[PDB]
Every structure is written in structure tokens, then in C-alpha cells.
Design a protein around this ligand. Structure first.
Ligand SMILES: *[C@@H]1O[C@H](CO)[C@@H](O[C@@H]2O[C@H](CO)[C@@H](O)[C@H](O)[C@H]2NC(C)=O)[C@H](O)[C@H]1NC(C)=O
Ligand SMILES: *[C@@H]1O[C@H](CO)[C@@H](O)[C@H](O)[C@H]1NC(C)=O
Lengths: 50, 36
């Protein structure tokens, strides 16, 4: 709407902004993240990991 | 004749139960905030 500056999701987090100069609406996607798992044969066999 | 080779009943069971996470479709909000 003409007066809305940003938007939110169902969990009250920010997901969009209004550019202060161009008034373009921009979605905010979080930067990629995730867990890291290390797969190892065990240090008593080999030191190669994935 | 159907992909996944599930029975008509299994197909119905998957069609009745749906996932509705507060996120968006991802191929692998989408990852919430530190929650995977
Ligand atoms: C002020 O905001 C206006 C937009 O409301 C800016 O004007 C635009 O500038 C871009 C280039 O950066 C042009 O391509 C657009 O056509 C312009 N639109 C209009 C309506 O003028 C303006 O540059 C901003 N800054 C100043 C100092 O006016
Ligand atoms: C990974 O990105 C490529 C980009 O072309 C896309 O074609 C592919 O389907 C993507 N796969 C997954 C699992 O996201």
C-alpha cells in the first residue's frame, strides 16, 4: 500500500522492504546456511574425511 | 502406472496429510532463523 514501508511473515520476521528513493519493493531472502556434518572412517583407519 | 509405485490407498494417505511449515518451497522463511 502507499504507506507501507516493509512487510513480515506469519512469524513476525522481516521479509520485504520499500526502497526509500525508488519505491521498488524488494524481498529479503536469508543468506544460505545449514549444518555441517563431517563423515570420517575414524582416525584409527584413515584421515580422509568428507 | 504411477510414480513412486505406491498403492491407491497409499497415494490417498499422502494426499490427505499435508505439510504446512511456515516457509517456502526449496529444492535442497525457507530456513526460518537458524532452524533447519
Ligand atoms: C528522488 O527520487 C526520485 C524518484 O521519486 C528520483 O528520480 C528518479 O531517478 C532515476 C535515476 O536515478 C530516474 O531513472 C527516474 O526516472 C527518476 N524518476 C523521477 C520520477 O524523477 C531522484 O533521482 C531522487 N533524487 C533526487 C535528488 O531527486
Ligand atoms: C541447483 O542449482 C541448479 C542451477 O542451475 C539447478 O538447476 C538445480 O536444480 C539445483 N538443485 C537443487 C537441489 O537445488
Amino acid at each position: 500500500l502507499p504507506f507501507q514501508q516493509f512487510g513480515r511473515d506469519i512469524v513476525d520476521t522481516t521479509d520485504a522492504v520499500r526502497d526509500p528513493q525508488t519505491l521498488e519493493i524488494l524481498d529479503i531472502t536469508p543468506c544460505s546456511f545449514g549444518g555441517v556434518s563431517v563423515i570420517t572412517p575414524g582416525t584409527n583407519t584413515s584421515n580422509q574425511v568428507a | 502406472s504411477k510414480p513412486s509405485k505406491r498403492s491407491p490407498i497409499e497415494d490417498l494417505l499422502f494426499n490427505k496429510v499435508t505439510l504446512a511449515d511456515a516457509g517456502f518451497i526449496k529444492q535442497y522463511a525457507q530456513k526460518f532463523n537458524g532452524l533447519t
